[PDB]
Design a protein around this motif. Structure first.
Motif, PDB file in Angstrom:
ATOM      1  N   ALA A 125      -9.889   6.209  -6.658  1.00  0.00           N
ATOM      2  CA  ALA A 125      -9.482   6.237  -8.057  1.00  0.00           C
ATOM      3  C   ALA A 125     -10.682   6.090  -8.982  1.00  0.00           C
ATOM      4  O   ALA A 125     -10.752   6.746 -10.027  1.00  0.00           O
ATOM      5  CB  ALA A 125      -8.454   5.140  -8.324  1.00  0.00           C
ATOM      6  N   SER A 184      -4.197   0.351  -9.616  1.00  0.00           N
ATOM      7  CA  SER A 184      -4.829   0.306  -8.305  1.00  0.00           C
ATOM      8  C   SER A 184      -5.592  -0.987  -8.093  1.00  0.00           C
ATOM      9  O   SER A 184      -5.412  -1.650  -7.069  1.00  0.00           O
ATOM     10  CB  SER A 184      -5.765   1.497  -8.132  1.00  0.00           C
ATOM     11  OG  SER A 184      -5.038   2.676  -7.843  1.00  0.00           O
ATOM     12  N   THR A 185      -6.445  -1.364  -9.039  1.00  0.00           N
ATOM     13  CA  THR A 185      -7.171  -2.615  -8.890  1.00  0.00           C
ATOM     14  C   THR A 185      -6.233  -3.810  -8.894  1.00  0.00           C
ATOM     15  O   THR A 185      -6.393  -4.724  -8.079  1.00  0.00           O
ATOM     16  CB  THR A 185      -8.199  -2.746  -9.996  1.00  0.00           C
ATOM     17  OG1 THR A 185      -7.530  -3.048 -11.225  1.00  0.00           O
ATOM     18  CG2 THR A 185      -8.938  -1.441 -10.142  1.00  0.00           C
ATOM     19  N   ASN A 233       0.822  -1.202   0.000  1.00  0.00           N
ATOM     20  CA  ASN A 233       0.000   0.000   0.000  1.00  0.00           C
ATOM     21  C   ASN A 233       0.857   1.253   0.000  1.00  0.00           C
ATOM     22  O   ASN A 233       0.684   2.131  -0.848  1.00  0.00           O
ATOM     23  CB  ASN A 233      -0.937   0.007   1.203  1.00  0.00           C
ATOM     24  CG  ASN A 233      -2.174  -0.825   0.980  1.00  0.00           C
ATOM     25  OD1 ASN A 233      -2.989  -0.527   0.112  1.00  0.00           O
ATOM     26  ND2 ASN A 233      -2.328  -1.872   1.771  1.00  0.00           N
ATOM     27  N   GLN A 258      -4.390   5.044 -13.613  1.00  0.00           N
ATOM     28  CA  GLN A 258      -4.225   4.927 -12.170  1.00  0.00           C
ATOM     29  C   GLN A 258      -5.093   3.814 -11.604  1.00  0.00           C
ATOM     30  O   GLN A 258      -4.654   3.055 -10.734  1.00  0.00           O
ATOM     31  CB  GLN A 258      -4.558   6.258 -11.501  1.00  0.00           C
ATOM     32  CG  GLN A 258      -4.176   6.322 -10.039  1.00  0.00           C
ATOM     33  CD  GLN A 258      -4.086   7.742  -9.532  1.00  0.00           C
ATOM     34  OE1 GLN A 258      -3.925   8.679 -10.311  1.00  0.00           O
ATOM     35  NE2 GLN A 258      -4.192   7.910  -8.220  1.00  0.00           N
ATOM     36  N   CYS A 259      -6.331   3.701 -12.084  1.00  0.00           N
ATOM     37  CA  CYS A 259      -7.203   2.634 -11.610  1.00  0.00           C
ATOM     38  C   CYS A 259      -6.620   1.271 -11.940  1.00  0.00           C
ATOM     39  O   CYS A 259      -6.627   0.362 -11.103  1.00  0.00           O
ATOM     40  CB  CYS A 259      -8.593   2.783 -12.220  1.00  0.00           C
ATOM     41  SG  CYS A 259      -9.644   3.987 -11.395  1.00  0.00           S
ATOM     42  N   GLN A 312      -3.282  -3.680  -7.851  1.00  0.00           N
ATOM     43  CA  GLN A 312      -2.782  -3.584  -6.489  1.00  0.00           C
ATOM     44  C   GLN A 312      -3.748  -4.236  -5.512  1.00  0.00           C
ATOM     45  O   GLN A 312      -3.332  -4.972  -4.612  1.00  0.00           O
ATOM     46  CB  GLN A 312      -2.555  -2.119  -6.143  1.00  0.00           C
ATOM     47  CG  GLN A 312      -2.423  -1.809  -4.693  1.00  0.00           C
ATOM     48  CD  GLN A 312      -1.479  -0.662  -4.481  1.00  0.00           C
ATOM     49  OE1 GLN A 312      -0.380  -0.653  -5.029  1.00  0.00           O
ATOM     50  NE2 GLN A 312      -1.901   0.323  -3.705  1.00  0.00           N
ATOM     51  N   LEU A 313      -5.047  -3.995  -5.690  1.00  0.00           N
ATOM     52  CA  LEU A 313      -6.038  -4.681  -4.871  1.00  0.00           C
ATOM     53  C   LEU A 313      -5.976  -6.182  -5.085  1.00  0.00           C
ATOM     54  O   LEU A 313      -6.170  -6.959  -4.143  1.00  0.00           O
ATOM     55  CB  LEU A 313      -7.438  -4.169  -5.184  1.00  0.00           C
ATOM     56  CG  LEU A 313      -8.454  -4.412  -4.074  1.00  0.00           C
ATOM     57  CD1 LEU A 313      -8.230  -3.436  -2.951  1.00  0.00           C
ATOM     58  CD2 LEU A 313      -9.861  -4.291  -4.604  1.00  0.00           C
ATOM     59  N   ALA A 329      -6.482  -0.353   0.810  1.00  0.00           N
ATOM     60  CA  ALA A 329      -6.393  -0.619  -0.616  1.00  0.00           C
ATOM     61  C   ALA A 329      -7.767  -0.545  -1.261  1.00  0.00           C
ATOM     62  O   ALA A 329      -7.922  -0.004  -2.361  1.00  0.00           O
ATOM     63  CB  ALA A 329      -5.750  -1.982  -0.851  1.00  0.00           C
ATOM     64  N   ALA A 349       2.939   2.309  -3.077  1.00  0.00           N
ATOM     65  CA  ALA A 349       2.211   2.642  -4.294  1.00  0.00           C
ATOM     66  C   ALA A 349       2.141   4.140  -4.522  1.00  0.00           C
ATOM     67  O   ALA A 349       1.901   4.583  -5.650  1.00  0.00           O
ATOM     68  CB  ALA A 349       0.803   2.061  -4.241  1.00  0.00           C
ATOM     69  N   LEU A 409      -8.487   2.880  -1.688  1.00  0.00           N
ATOM     70  CA  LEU A 409      -7.668   3.503  -2.717  1.00  0.00           C
ATOM     71  C   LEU A 409      -8.290   3.326  -4.096  1.00  0.00           C
ATOM     72  O   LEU A 409      -8.325   4.266  -4.897  1.00  0.00           O
ATOM     73  CB  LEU A 409      -6.260   2.918  -2.665  1.00  0.00           C
ATOM     74  CG  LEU A 409      -5.135   3.731  -3.292  1.00  0.00           C
ATOM     75  CD1 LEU A 409      -5.049   5.086  -2.623  1.00  0.00           C
ATOM     76  CD2 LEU A 409      -3.826   2.991  -3.132  1.00  0.00           C
ATOM     77  N   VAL A 410      -8.802   2.130  -4.385  1.00  0.00           N
ATOM     78  CA  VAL A 410      -9.471   1.910  -5.661  1.00  0.00           C
ATOM     79  C   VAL A 410     -10.762   2.708  -5.730  1.00  0.00           C
ATOM     80  O   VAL A 410     -11.143   3.207  -6.793  1.00  0.00           O
ATOM     81  CB  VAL A 410      -9.714   0.408  -5.891  1.00  0.00           C
ATOM     82  CG1 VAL A 410     -10.692  -0.142  -4.885  1.00  0.00           C
ATOM     83  CG2 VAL A 410     -10.237   0.177  -7.276  1.00  0.00           C
TER      84      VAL A 410
END
Length: 1852
Positions: free
Chosen positions: A460, A426-427, A273, A422-423, A429-430, A453, A276, A456-457
């Motif tokens: 985004a 991010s996803t 997290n 970015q998404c 990352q999820l 996280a 990122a 965060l998504v």
């Protein structure tokens, strides 16, 4: 030259009168005198009075309002009518001479040192000078020359000035005109100087992270290498008790292993997290806080696995796959860190892919252990749901990308491109985070990362929707949102599905589970909401239907089930509820009828309780079972968040290895918990095995409740360790673990209590169960004893088994006293608790007994102790089963006797078992030899042969020194091996009998035979003192290293040296003529051993006390040697020996006072740590027991004379009364609730015996009747039994004596006092023998030569010791150390302030602004926690002051270092300048305190002029911390962060549970009047929070702060309220409701802030509202428990609030009456209103009468009385406004007084109510009761005044 003089005159008038020149009022009065002398000329005394002199144009406008007009007039007479030109010259020269000439002046607000306050200072600027000038005096307070300035500065509001050279510190003053002052001083200093003129480069933070992972990586592989080798394990064998330890360590490891793999996974996510973020924005320290967490917990895993694996190998299971799992995990952890390093520039995918391995790898490792709570199927749900969330992500990616074609504007094209990109990461990352956290979803900390996280998504996604808005009004938005809505819905699906597994006791639920759970939640309200009728019945509604549904459902279930037999019991049990339900239903309807009958609320409850039980009678047992799984998931949770802190100390605190400061009190604190966990987890697995056996559930409750207090001390210690630690990464890893543990305890204390009420009563047979199980277990041990191969447990040694086995029996014997005290009190529920203790100690004793045998060698030696151990079990077993048997009927005299008869036996059993241990041996021989000697010593000592009456008696004293020598051997033997101590005792034993024979033989040799009774008593006193001294030796034989026991043996040795002196004083012969000199020589021998090593305290009186006690003893010893010496020249023997006795008493006192001077200085060394002094003083208590029993022993013999009868009462009543007070002081300081009840009860048993005995001793006064003497013998038994009982209670080891620990260098500072003290006795000892011979011969030069030679050596030791005592002066060294350390801390700020003033302070880039405050906070919290203990030490004791200040200094540089950074990040300059200034005040005040403490020095003799300074200093700093703690908390609230708010709660919950309960000021009422008022605030706030969520979410910050602050107040008064309530049940409930309010707010506030960082989220705005209801409900509960105070009443409070609301309603009518809007309607008459008033008014007074007469009585009637009062006023309030309107607002003033009349009347009612509240539960003549009638009459007079008032307005 008059022209220039007149011009100077005029311009000086200008300069002064406008205020441009500072002139004091008196000096301005002389100026005004000159004024009148010139322009009013020579003033006339008659005509120049006040009225024509205009002050404003005659004095400076600041002093015109001082209006000293007549004072200015005698100033005019002072100047008189003297010549005008000389008046002019005096004017000019008085203006000139004033030091404030030639210099401009400015009003600048200056900050006082010590407060966050500001005061004016007319700063003066000179061509050569900088001067501070006071505002009032207009006179210089301080002066500086310009040449010393080095760098000034200009601020929009500040002018900082510095010197550097003269005073270490600068001059910072704020002013709006700082710019002009700065430029002016720049020019001035310029003139003064001209007069004497002739990206590969890493951000600096990244280096720190680079090392930390490098440091970690090195620790990683080292841990990895150790894995492969199976080291060893101790040999244990086949012993069943041993096999249990084999089983436990495995299981313990299984939990130990899990917690770190829980930590490793959680940490990895934190890296994922936090990394990122954009580089140059992340919190590397947090990554350090993560990587160290990853590494530190990586290695304790390595220790765990090897220990587990070896245990696996003794079983058939092969440990090889386990290690393969470990090494596979190990590398995966390592390979992550390779991508963690900021230098490596690999693609971001490497980091994400690396982490996923860790979760993948850590998975099967748990699969090898079998310790994974989460279902395998549930993981797949997460796996696919994550992908499902990932799936929706791809969809929005395309649609957002589809917009890119639609996009037309350059740049605005790529913004949508940017958002979608970015998404995508991010996803993904999820996706990885979810993979990482998959195997350890149970722990909270893992879950708390997942949401971040997930947050965060979400943010985004919202960005992409905002990006889509950059397009132009097309369906793309609608289809974009339709794609986004699925992604948010998928995220919600992933998170709620996430939370489900958080709290799951078991997978299957059965059939009626969802019905069963519903009743619990609502029954729980019923038990909780006592005291509020409306709530109980309202729930009773929703319950009755709900259980009816169960009734219906089971009814259909019985129909479906086909077997008739089962179909019966299904229905048969079903009927039981039906009866139970209606029983509740009718009871509910009953309490509904009577809202205020406290019995009905008891009735409604009591039905509800069995209602739960009736659900248990139904086949589902969940009502009881569910409340255990809410503990099994609580204990494991706290057990993990312990073993995740325990490691978080070992790694992090190893860095300094500093023997001073807070660390050494941490590791010792961690020791207690480190052995408590295995007693907890082992219990948890017990419940997991047989949830259907109530014994296990009690055990889990038993273990968990115990755990808290040892556990709690870690947290309050760790939070005190955070600032000192220097490596920030290992620091933060400690605080976060401490906060987690802090929560996991408040969520234990709660879930434990639930289990306590729900669980079935102990029935004191679980104890019977355990002992019988123990009985059979040791039988196996006794059976396995003949097997001959029993191997010892790993950790115990022969010297270690005893010291607990010795301690264990004293616990049990103390425990049994609890049981008897309870049974006499009558079948309490605590009586079950007592059976737990007696059982609990029996487990300890049995286990200890097993330990000795397995280690001791000879089987016959082995077998015997088990028998007496087994004998203890069976004998005590009879007691327990008898206790419950005798518990059936209280108040049966034979029951206590039959109990005590057995209860005596168990004590008789234990003492045998202790001695049966062969290690300590042959002391029994000595005591028995003494005891057997007492038998022939007790009887008719007669001389068979006279021998020599004078000479053999003199020969006896020639052998006397031998017994004295014999005893002094023992205390020396106390410092050697236990076998060695037997020798001195053995030699003492032979010495006693041999000397006693010569004692008894010449005992009857005395002529008088009444002296024969004396000499035997003289031998008795010597006997018992010696015997109890041996009894003292008996104790040490089993606990060698304990210094507290050694001090008791020395005190017992002091008993005999006085006791042996008792014989020699009167009975023995003075034929040598110097018999007191041996008493000097014997005592001088004994006092020496006491000073030999003062490891432990010898007395209570403190350092400066023992200084004086030494000081006075120095003089007396100076006098005593003069006394004996001159009488030797006179050869006068009797007066020669007189000063000897005082000298020895001076010596004995001196050396004791000197020994105390050693212990005191010994503790004060910074390294060492003190003790807690215990509760019962072993020295005073023991003799207190002795003296009382000695007294009654005297009356035991038949011949009672007023010589002994009257003396006996005096010694008894003086001591037994004192003995009571010992309990009472201790009982209020205990923390065990059981001790409180037992201390009070037992202490009164002697008092009841005292009253019975004192009556009989008075009944024997002057009668001497044999039965009157016999009835004294009978009345003896109750007191002796009671004191022996109470003494038996006190030997519980937990109660007293923790031995203080002394550093080696601590001992170093002690020796200079010790050495000088030792030689003084040595010098004295040889000087004593000189006196005896010189008493015979008047002179002999060599004898009289050494007489002086020793005496100066005696003197030299005395003076040199005193020299050391005053020069050492503990407490004035480290105060100098702290001050310097403090004073430098001030300097940094003062410069760091200046750097920011001209905007140069460079923001440190490592850390985010949020984290600095957190450190800046936990720093401050500790300081305020140490304020009072320091102010305590500065008053009474110095030894403690030595350690405290050194703790209050080390918190500062970690603060100031943070503070300089803290203001560095902050952007708005006014904020940063103040943020430092308040910190600057904190140290400044702290310095002021430290000065006073040095002067305070812990001296009781310092007077109020010094004492007051201490107290007034504390207040300046105590309110300083309050000023600062707001400025952080508040500034931590504007930003969305919620930390501390979620901590001050989770702490003020724990502060609520422990401490002293002694009823501080206030009744139970005046608590309940405010505590309720506070309870409303946290109610009015949550409803003030719900609205803001929809309206304007940015304000949720300060509200959440205002919530958690008030809950601080409601926490503080809670426990004092609980103690001051009449019934413990009322008290405990007011607490437990406050706590169950606590968990509500913590969940509330965490959401509350989290909304502010997503102000337009929709699904968090939900859980806020749902949780906001949860707290509001809980307040109603805690309000309800506050209504359980019969003392006072909500009727008292609510009425006052209501009638004030009626006054507010009258004020609203007054607003309309003032406005004239309140007009008449129709043609309403007035008699209707008057007569309606007439009833109510006379109803009110009758209601007043029943109100006032109810000031003493049940709450119910006065409740209606108040409820009648509120009814009467509101009905009156109804008619009066109708009556007032009946005139119309055309005559408002008529209406005014009328509405003002009731406005005053209702006020009087409230005053009556408020008086009524104060007048309840009162005596007939209480000072308030007349106040009541006055108020009652006040109502009576006001209503009659009211009656006339309306009666007179009927006309005009």
């Amino acid at each position: 030259d008059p022209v220039q003089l007149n011009l100077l005159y005029v311009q000086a008038r200008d300069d002064i009168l406008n205020g441009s020149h500072p002139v004091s009022f008196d000096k301005a009065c002389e100026f005004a005198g000159f004024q009148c002398q010139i322009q009013f000329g020579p003033h006339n005394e008659q005509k120049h009075k006040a009225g024509f002199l205009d002050l404003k144009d005659f004095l400076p406008k600041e002093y015109v309002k001082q209006k000293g007009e007549r004072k200015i007039f005698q100033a005019h007479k002072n100047c008189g009518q003297m010549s005008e030109i000389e008046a002019k010259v005096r004017y000019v020269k008085l203006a000139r001479s004033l030091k404030t000439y030639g210099v401009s002046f400015f009003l600048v607000k200056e900050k006082m040192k010590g407060k966050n306050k500001l005061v004016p200072r007319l700063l003066g600027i000179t061509k050569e000078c900088v001067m501070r000038v006071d505002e009032k005096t207009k006179e210089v307070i301080q002066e500086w020359s310009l040449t010393n300035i080095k760098r000034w500065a200009a601020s929009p509001k500040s002018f900082t000035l510095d010197f550097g050279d003269y005073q270490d510190g600068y001059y910072s003053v704020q002013t709006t005109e700082g710019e002009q002052i700065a430029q002016l001083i720049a020019g001035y200093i310029d003139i003064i100087l001209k007069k004497k003129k002739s990206m590969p480069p890493l951000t600096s933070a990244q280096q720190a992270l680079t090392g930390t992972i490098n440091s970690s990586m090195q620790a990683v592989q080292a841990a990895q290498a150790t894995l492969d080798d199976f080291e060893t394990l101790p040999p244990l064998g086949q012993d069943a008790a041993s096999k249990a330890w084999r089983k436990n360590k495995m299981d313990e490891s299984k939990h130990e292993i899990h917690s770190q793999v829980d930590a490793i996974t959680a940490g990895t996510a934190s890296v994922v997290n936090l990394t990122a973020g954009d580089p140059a924005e992340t919190d590397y320290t947090a990554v350090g806080c993560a990587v160290t967490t990853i590494s530190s917990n990586l290695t304790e895993m390595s220790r765990g696995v090897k220990l587990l694996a070896a245990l696996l190998e003794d079983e058939g299971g092969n440990g090889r796959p386990l290690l393969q799992a470990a090494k596979g995990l190990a590398g995966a952890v390592s390979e992550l860190l390779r991508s963690a390093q900021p230098a490596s520039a690999e693609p971001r995918q490497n980091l994400l892919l690396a982490a996923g391995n860790v979760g993948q790898a850590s998975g099967e490792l748990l699969q090898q252990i079998g310790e994974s709570d989460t279902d395998p199927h549930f993981q797949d749900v997460l796996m696919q749901l994550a992908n499902a969330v990932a799936s929706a992500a791809a969809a929005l990616v395309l649609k957002a990308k589809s917009v890119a074609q639609r996009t037309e504007d350059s740049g605005l094209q790529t913004q949508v491109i940017a958002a979608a990109t970015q998404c995508a990461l991010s996803t993904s990352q999820l996706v990885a985070c979810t993979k990482v956290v998959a195997p350890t979803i149970s722990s909270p900390v893992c879950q708390e990362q997942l949401v971040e996280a997930g947050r965060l998504v979400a943010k985004a996604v919202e960005g992409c929707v905002s990006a889509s808005q950059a397009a132009t009004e097309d369906g793309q938005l609608l289809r974009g949102v339709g794609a986004a809505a699925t992604a948010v819905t998928q995220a919600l699906n992933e998170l709620l599905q996430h939370v489900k597994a958080h709290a799951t006791g078991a997978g299957p639920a059965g059939r009626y589970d969802q019905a069963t759970d519903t009743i619990l939640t609502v029954t729980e309200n019923i038990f909780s909401s006592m005291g509020d009728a409306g709530e109980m019945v309202r729930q009773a509604r929703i319950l009755a239907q709900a259980t009816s549904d169960l009734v219906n459902a089971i009814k259909a279930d019985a129909e479906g089930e086909s077997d008739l037999e089962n179909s019966r019991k299904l229905l048969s049990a079903a009927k039981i509820l039906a009866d139970a339900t209606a029983k509740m239903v009718e009871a509910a309807k009953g309490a509904a009828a009577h809202p205020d009958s406290e019995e009905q609320q008891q009735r409604l409850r009591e039905a509800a309780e069995g209602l739960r039980m009736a659900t248990n009678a139904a086949a589902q047992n969940a009502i009881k079972k569910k409340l255990v799984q809410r503990l099994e998931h609580a204990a494991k949770q706290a057990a993990a968040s312990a073993t995740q802190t325990i490691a978080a100390a070992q790694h992090a605190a190893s860095a300094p290895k500093a023997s001073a400061g807070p660390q050494p009190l941490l590791v010792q604190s961690c020791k207690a918990v480190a052995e408590q966990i295995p007693l907890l987890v082992q219990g948890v697995r017990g419940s997991q095995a047989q949830p259907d056996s109530p014994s296990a559930q009690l055990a889990l409750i038993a273990a968990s409740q115990s755990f808290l207090q040892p556990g709690g001390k870690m947290v309050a210690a760790a939070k005190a360790s955070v600032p000192t630690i220097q490596d920030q990464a290992s620091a933060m890893q400690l605080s976060q673990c401490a906060k987690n543990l802090g929560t996991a305890l408040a969520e234990l204390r709660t879930a434990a209590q639930k289990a306590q009420e729900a669980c079935g009563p102990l029935e004191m047979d679980s104890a019977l169960s355990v002992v019988q199980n123990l009985e059979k277990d040791l039988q196996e041990i006794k059976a396995a004893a003949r097997d001959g191969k029993l191997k010892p447990l790993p950790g115990e040694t022969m010297e270690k088994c005893t010291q607990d086995l010795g301690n264990s029996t004293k616990a049990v014997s103390s425990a049994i006293a609890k049981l008897l005290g309870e049974i006499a009190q009558g079948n309490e529920n605590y009586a079950g608790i007592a059976a737990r203790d007696v059982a609990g100690g029996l487990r300890s004793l049995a286990q200890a007994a097993r330990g000795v045998a397995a280690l001791t060698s000879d089987p016959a030696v082995q077998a015997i102790v088990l028998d007496t151990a087994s004998d203890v079990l069976d004998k005590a077993s009879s007691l327990i089963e008898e206790a419950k048997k005798a518990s059936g009927h209280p108040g049966d005299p034979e029951s206590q006797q039959r109990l005590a008869q057995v209860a005596k036996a168990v004590t008789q059993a234990l003492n045998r078992c202790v001695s049966c241990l062969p290690g300590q041996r042959d002391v029994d021989n000595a005591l028995r030899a003494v005891g057997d000697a007492s038998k022939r010593l007790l009887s008719d000592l007669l001389p068979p042969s006279t021998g020599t009456f004078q000479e053999a008696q003199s020969r006896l004293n020639e052998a006397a020194a031998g017994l004295n020598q014999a005893a002094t051997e023992l205390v020396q033997a106390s410092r050697g091996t236990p076998q060695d101590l037997a020798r001195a005792s053995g030699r003492f034993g032979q010495d006693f009998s041999t000397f006693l024979e010569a004692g008894v033989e010449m005992a009857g040799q005395a002529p008088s035979q009444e002296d024969r009774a004396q000499v035997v008593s003289n031998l008795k006193g010597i006997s018992m003192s010696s015997s109890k001294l041996l009894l003292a030796a008996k104790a040490l034989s089993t606990d060698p290293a304990s210094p507290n026991l050694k001090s008791q043996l020395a005190a017992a040795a002091r008993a005999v040296t006085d006791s042996i002196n008792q014989l020699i004083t009167m009975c023995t012969q003075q034929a040598p003529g110097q018999k007191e000199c041996d008493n000097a020589l014997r005592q001088l021998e004994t006092v020496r051993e006491l000073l030999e090593n003062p490891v432990q305290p010898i007395n209570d009186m403190s350092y400066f006390g023992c200084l004086d006690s030494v000081m006075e003893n120095s003089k007396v010893l100076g006098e005593a040697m003069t006394g004996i010496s001159q009488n030797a020249k006179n050869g006068n023997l009797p007066e020669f020996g007189d000063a000897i006795a005082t000298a020895s008493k001076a010596l004995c006192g001196f050396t004791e006072a000197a020994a105390q001077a050693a212990y005191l200085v010994g503790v004060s060394d910074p390294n060492s740590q003190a003790g807690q002094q215990g509760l019962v003083e072993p020295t005073q208590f023991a003799r207190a027991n002795q003296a009382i029993q000695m007294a009654c022993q005297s009356l035991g013999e038949p011949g009672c004379t007023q010589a002994q009868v009257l003396s006996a009462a005096t010694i008894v009543a003086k001591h037994t009364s004192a003995l009571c007070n010992s309990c009472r002081l201790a009982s209020a300081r205990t923390a065990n609730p059981t001790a409180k009840r037992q201390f009070v009860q037992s202490a009164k048993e002697v008092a009841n015996s005292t009253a019975n005995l004192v009556k009989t001793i008075k009944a024997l006064d002057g009668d001497f009747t044999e039965e009157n003497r016999a009835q004294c013998r009978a009345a003896t038994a109750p007191l002796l039994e009671a004191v022996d009982n109470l003494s038996a209670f006190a030997s519980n080891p937990e109660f007293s004596s923790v031995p203080a620990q002394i550093s080696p260098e601590g001992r170093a500072a002690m020796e200079p006092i010790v050495i000088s003290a030792k030689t003084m006795l040595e010098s004295a000892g040889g000087l004593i023998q000189t006196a005896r011979a010189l008493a015979v011969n008047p002179r002999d030069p060599p004898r009289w030569s050494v007489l002086a030679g020793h005496s100066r050596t005696v003197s030299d030791s005395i003076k040199k010791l005193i020299t050391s005592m005053r020069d050492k002066a503990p407490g004035q060294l480290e105060c100098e150390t702290a001050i310097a350390a403090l004073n430098s801390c001030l300097r940094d700020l003062d410069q760091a302030s200046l750097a920011a003033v001209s905007q140069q302070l460079a923001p440190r880039e490592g850390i985010s602004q949020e984290a600095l405050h957190t450190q800046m906070l936990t720093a401050v919290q500790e300081i305020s926690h140490l304020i009072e203990p320091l102010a305590s030490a500065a008053r009474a004791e110095a030894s403690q002051l030595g350690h405290k200040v050194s703790q209050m200094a080390q918190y500062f540089e970690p603060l100031t270092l943070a503070a300089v950074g803290a203001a560095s990040k902050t952007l708005s300059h006014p904020q940063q300048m103040a943020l430092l200034d308040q910190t600057k005040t904190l140290a400044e005040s702290a310095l002021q305190l430290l000065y006073t403490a040095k002067e305070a020095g812990g001296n009781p003799k310092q007077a109020a002029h010094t004492q007051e300074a201490l107290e007034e200093a504390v207040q300046m700093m105590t309110e300083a911390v309050e000023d600062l703690t707001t400025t952080l908390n508040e500034a931590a609230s504007a930003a969305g962060v919620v930390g501390g708010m979620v901590d001050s709660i989770t702490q003020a919950i724990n502060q609520l549970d422990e401490g002293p309960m002694g009823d501080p000021e206030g009744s139970f009422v005046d608590y309940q009047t405010t505590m309720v008022r506070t309870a409303k605030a946290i109610a009015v706030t949550v409803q003030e929070m719900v609205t803001k969520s929809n309206t304007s979410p940015e304000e949720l910050g300060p509200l959440a702060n205002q919530l958690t602050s008030d809950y601080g107040r409601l926490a503080s008064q809670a426990k004092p309220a609980a103690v001051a309530a009449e019934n413990e049940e009322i008290g405990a409930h007011i607490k437990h409701r406050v706590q169950e309010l606590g968990h509500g707010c913590s969940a509330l506030v965490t959401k509350a802030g989290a909304l502010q960082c997503s102000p337009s989220d929709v699904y968090t705005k939900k859980e806020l509202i749902e949780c906001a209801r949860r707290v509001s409900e809980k307040v109603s509960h805690v309000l309800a428990a506050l209504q359980a105070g019969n003392r006072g009443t909500q009727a008292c409070i609510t009425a006052a609030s209501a009638v004030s609301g009626i006054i507010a309603d009258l004020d609203t009518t007054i607003m309309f009456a003032t406005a004239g809007t309140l007009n008449r309607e129709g043609a309403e008459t007035f008699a209707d209103h008057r007569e309606g008033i007439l009833k109510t008014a006379k109803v009110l007074v009758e209601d007043t009468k029943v109100l006032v007469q109810n000031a003493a009585g049940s709450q119910e009637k006065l409740a209606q009385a108040a409820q009648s009062s509120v009814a009467t006023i509101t009905r009156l309030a109804d008619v009066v406004k109708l009556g007032a309107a009946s005139l119309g607002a055309e005559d408002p003033e008529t209406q005014v007084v009328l509405i003002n009349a009731v406005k005053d009347v209702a006020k009087a009612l409230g005053d009556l109510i408020s008086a009524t509240k104060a007048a309840a539960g009162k005596v007939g003549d209480d000072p308030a009761v007349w106040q009541l009638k006055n108020s009652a009459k006040v109502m009576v007079t006001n209503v009659t005044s009211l009656l006339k008032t309306v009666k007179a307005v009927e006309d005009e």
